[PDB]
Design a protein around this ligand. Structure first.
Ligand code: HEC
Ligand code: HEC
Lengths: 111, 100
C-alpha cells in the first residue's frame, strides 16, 4: 500500500519529463516513446490511489480527470500529434491543480 | 441530480470550484477547501462541513441548488455566475464530499 506522498512523487517525475518535451517541434521516436511511458506512469498513479487511498468520491473523480488527460497524451504521442500533446498536457496540469487547491488549500504545491 | 462524469477539465465543475473565472475570495475552495471541511477563512465565516453526514442530512438536493443560486450571508450568490447545469453539477460535488 503506497502513501499519498509516494504516489505524488510517482507522478511528479514523469510529469516533469513530460513537461520538458511539450515545447519542442519534434517527433523523435525515442521521445514519443518516453512520452507514452510517462503517461503510463501517471495513469498507474491514479489507479494505485484508487486501490489504496480512500478519501471521498470527489477525490476519486479528480484523479479520474488527471487520468482522462494522461490517456489523451498517450493517444496523441502515438499519433505524433504534438499540438494535441501540448493542449492535453496543459489541461492535465489544471487537473493536478484542481485537487491540490481543493484538498491542500492552505499550502503551495507544484505544478 | 445529474451527477458529473469525469472528463475534460475545461468542462469540469472542479475547475470552477478551484476558482476559474472567479476572484479568490469568491472561489468555492477558498472557503470550502480542505476537502470540503472548510478552510481557516471559511470557518471564520461559519462554513459547514461538507464531509459531515450531520450537515448533509440538513439539506435536500433542491435546497443545495437553491442556496448556491441565492447565497446567504457570507456565502455569496452564484445565480448568473455559472449556468444552471453547472450549479447542478456543483450540488453533486457538495454531496460527494460525504461519500466514502
Ligand atoms: C487529488 C485527487 C490529487 C490529484 C489529482 C493530484 N494530487 Fe498531488 N497531492 C495531493 C495532495 C492531497 C497532496 C498533499 C500531500 C501531503 O503530503 O500533504 C499532494 C501533493 C503533491 C506533491 C508534493 C508532495 C511532497 O513531495 O511533499 C506533488 C509533487 C504532487 N502532488 C504532484 C501531482 C501531480 C504532478 C499531479 C497531476 C499529474 C497531481 N499531484 C495530482 C492530491 C492530488
Ligand atoms: C466564503 C467567501 C465562501 C465562498 C467563496 C463560498 N462559500 Fe459556500 N458557504 C459559505 C458560508 C459562510 C456558508 C454558510 C452560510 C449560512 O450561514 O448558512 C456557506 C454555505 C454553503 C452551502 C450550504 C447552504 C447554506 O448553508 O446556505 C453550500 C451548498 C455552499 N455554501 C456551496 C458553495 C459553493 C458551491 C461555492 C462555490 C461556487 C461556495 N459555497 C463558495 C462561505 C463561502
Amino acid at each position: 500500500a503506497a502513501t499519498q506522498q509516494e504516489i505524488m512523487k510517482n507522478m511528479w517525475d514523469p510529469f516533469q519529463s513530460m513537461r520538458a518535451v511539450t515545447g519542442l517541434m519534434e517527433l523523435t521516436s525515442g521521445q514519443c516513446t518516453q512520452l507514452s511511458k510517462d503517461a503510463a506512469a501517471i495513469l498507474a498513479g491514479v489507479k494505485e490511489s484508487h486501490d489504496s487511498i480512500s478519501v471521498d468520491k470527489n477525490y476519486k473523480v479528480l484523479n479520474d480527470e488527471v487520468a482522462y488527460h494522461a490517456a489523451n497524451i498517450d493517444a496523441a504521442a502515438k499519433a505524433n500529434d504534438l499540438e494535441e500533446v501540448q493542449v492535453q498536457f496543459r489541461r492535465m496540469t489544471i487537473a493536478c491543480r484542481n485537487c491540490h487547491k481543493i484538498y491542500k488549500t492552505e499550502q503551495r504545491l507544484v505544478p | 441530480l445529474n451527477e458529473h462524469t469525469a472528463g475534460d477539465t475545461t468542462k469540469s465543475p472542479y475547475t470552477i470550484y478551484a476558482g476559474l473565472g472567479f476572484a479568490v475570495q469568491e472561489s468555492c475552495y477558498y472557503c470550502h477547501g480542505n476537502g470540503g471541511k472548510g478552510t481557516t477563512e471559511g470557518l471564520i465565516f461559519g462554513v459547514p462541513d461538507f464531509t459531515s453526514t450531520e450537515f448533509q442530512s440538513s439539506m435536500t438536493d433542491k435546497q443545495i441548488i437553491d442556496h448556491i443560486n441565492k447565497g446567504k450571508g457570507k456565502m455569496p450568490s452564484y445565480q448568473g455566475k455559472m449556468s444552471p447545469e453547472m450549479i447542478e453539477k456543483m450540488a453533486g460535488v457538495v454531496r460527494n464530499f460525504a461519500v466514502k
